[PDB]
Structure formats: structure tokens, C-alpha cells
């Protein structure tokens, strides 16, 4: 897989590696799930999420 197509399947950030290797990464205040693509908050107020709306659909 490649980062320039479909974000490499990553929810957030994507690095291409020597070989057919891709690594997804997450912003500070998030951790990468075992699927290797998804990012989940590790703190109360992660960047780029709107608490009153996250609470609205939680």
C-alpha cells in the first residue's frame, strides 16, 4: 500500500517504507489501534475533536 493513494488506509498520518511496507501513525494525544490504521484518543481533549459534539453522539 502507498500513502498517496487513499491515505494508505491510515486514519491519520502515513509513512512509506523500503519494500511494500507502510506505517500509519497518530498525532499526539492519540494511539494507533491493532488494525494498524485507526487512531483513538488517549487524553480528554485531543486536537481536532469537538467535545460538545463527541458527547452528543457518545
Amino acid at each position: 500500500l502507498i500513502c498517496v493513494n487513499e491515505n494508505g488506509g491510515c486514519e491519520q498520518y502515513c509513512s512509506d517504507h523500503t519494500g511494500t511496507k507502510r506505517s500509519c501513525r497518530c498525532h499526539e494525544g492519540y494511539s494507533l489501534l491493532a488494525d494498524g490504521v485507526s487512531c483513538t484518543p488517549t487524553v480528554e481533549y485531543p486536537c481536532g475533536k469537538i467535545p460538545i459534539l463527541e458527547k452528543r453522539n457518545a
Partner: protein, 250 residues
């Protein structure tokens, strides 16, 4: 903002209001607890640098509800390539004197990695621009925070569809050419924010245009992806005496 709507209180929690001697100067974007991104041109006429205030958690300017947090601006960092009175490299990085406290009403916008921003975010058509700027060209500024969804144009297509500064690689166009919807005076420095898979990211800064909502013209926005590494390096740097810092770019 022209032709938008009120941003419901708390739904634009990264929005910053910049004040000089208590008067409205500009907008800005919170990107973590101490750092705010704005527009270089906001500071072209500053005389006393020690009178700059940033306010987070702001919504209705006519009242205090207690969610507001004010901080002195300790540093203003502007790239060496910016020339006052002109439009290219229209970006400024502000250090707050004390961190803000993250709350339901005060949340940073994610500063994306460059590659992600160039390869993915740049192709998200619509993004949100916000501010307490003028509601109409030659009109009064907003008392409640306004927000506007604007489509991004490829620069070739902006130049083709527009009808005088250049559109450089450090800029992009977004909005409408029919005079209905635009960012306006007072909105300068504020966020152009882009949603991708559940999270919002900083892609632009309210920069300039041919007046406000001028028919045949689009809003011009600083292309933040060109500045990610520059910003990241400065955020790791020790503070320097004196508010203004001109820092080399690239």
C-alpha cells in the same frame, strides 16, 4: 465573515481572538496549549508589542460567561521571507505567556504532517473558515463567532475563474466568485479548518483578497502545509527576549 452562520458556542473551540489595547485585531488558531497560528499581516502596524492579548473560549463579545481565557502574547514569530504590506508568507506563530487550560470550549486544532496535508487534506473540497470579522463588505463586525463552509480551488483554476498580487505556492484560493460568501476584515489570521475521518486539521489562514466578497474573486488563504516543518522547529525552540522574532524560512 460574509454569508455564513453563527458557530454554535463550543463548536469552533480552536478559534482565537487577538486584541490590542482591548480592541479587535485579528483571529488565530490554537494548535496546542501554548501556541497559536495567525497571519503575519496582522502585526504590520503594531507599536507596543506588549499590549497583545489572545482570548480562547470566546463566543459572544458582548458578555462574559466564564469559558473565556485570556493570555498575554509573549512571542510573535514571523518568517524572514514575509515583507510587511505584502501578501506572500502570511503566517505568524504566537507563543502565549502561560498555557491555556483545555476544556469543552478550548481545544486545539491538529497541525497536520506535511505529506498528509499535501496528499490528502488538499483534496478535501470544503473546509470551515471562522471569525468575528465584518458581516458585510464595509459593514459592522460580528458580536457572535461566525463560520462559513468554503470550497477550495486548484490555483490554475482560481486564476482561470478569477476576473493585483499573484497566487504563489504559499497560498490557495477558496470560496465563491458570486459575492455571497467570504472571509472579511477582522477575520484575518483565523482558521481554515479541514475535516478528515472524524478529526479537524489546520490547512489555511485567512490572508487576503480583492476586498471582501468581491464578485469575480475568491478568498486567498495561506497554505499552511508549506510551513509545517518551520512551525515544528520553532515550537521546540527556547523563547527569546523581545516579542517579535523574525526566523529564517525555510
Amino acid at each position: 465573515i460574509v454569508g455564513g452562520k453563527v458557530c454554535p458556542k463550543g463548536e469552533c473551540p480552536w478559534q482565537v481572538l487577538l486584541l490590542v489595547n482591548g480592541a479587535q485585531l485579528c483571529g488565530g488558531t490554537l494548535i496546542n496549549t501554548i501556541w497559536v497560528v495567525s497571519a503575519a499581516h496582522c502585526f504590520d502596524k503594531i507599536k507596543n508589542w506588549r499590549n497583545l492579548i489572545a482570548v480562547l473560549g470566546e463566543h459572544d463579545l458582548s458578555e462574559h460567561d466564564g469559558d473565556e481565557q485570556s493570555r498575554r502574547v509573549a512571542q510573535v514569530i514571523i518568517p524572514s521571507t514575509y515583507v510587511p504590506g505584502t501578501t506572500n508568507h502570511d503566517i505568524a506563530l504566537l507563543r502565549l505567556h502561560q498555557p491555556v487550560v483545555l476544556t469543552d470550549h478550548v481545544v486545539p486544532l491538529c497541525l497536520p504532517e506535511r505529506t498528509f496535508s499535501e496528499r490528502t487534506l488538499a483534496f478535501v473540497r470544503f473546509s470551515l473558515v471562522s471569525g468575528w470579522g465584518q458581516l458585510l463588505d464595509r459593514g459592522a463586525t460580528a458580536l457572535e463567532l461566525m463560520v462559513l463552509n468554503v470550497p477550495r480551488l486548484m490555483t490554475q483554476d482560481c486564476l482561470q475563474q478569477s476576473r493585483s498580487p499573484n497566487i504563489t505556492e504559499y497560498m490557495f484560493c477558496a470560496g465563491y466568485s458570486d459575492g455571497s460568501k467570504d472571509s472579511c476584515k477582522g477575520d484575518s489570521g483565523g482558521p481554515h479548518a479541514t475535516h478528515y475521518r472524524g478529526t479537524w486539521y489546520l490547512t489555511g489562514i485567512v490572508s487576503w483578497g480583492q476586498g471582501c466578497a468581491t464578485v469575480g474573486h475568491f478568498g486567498v488563504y495561506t497554505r499552511v502545509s508549506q510551513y509545517i516543518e518551520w512551525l515544528q522547529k520553532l515550537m521546540r525552540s527556547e523563547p527569546r527576549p523581545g516579542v517579535l522574532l523574525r526566523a529564517p524560512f525555510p
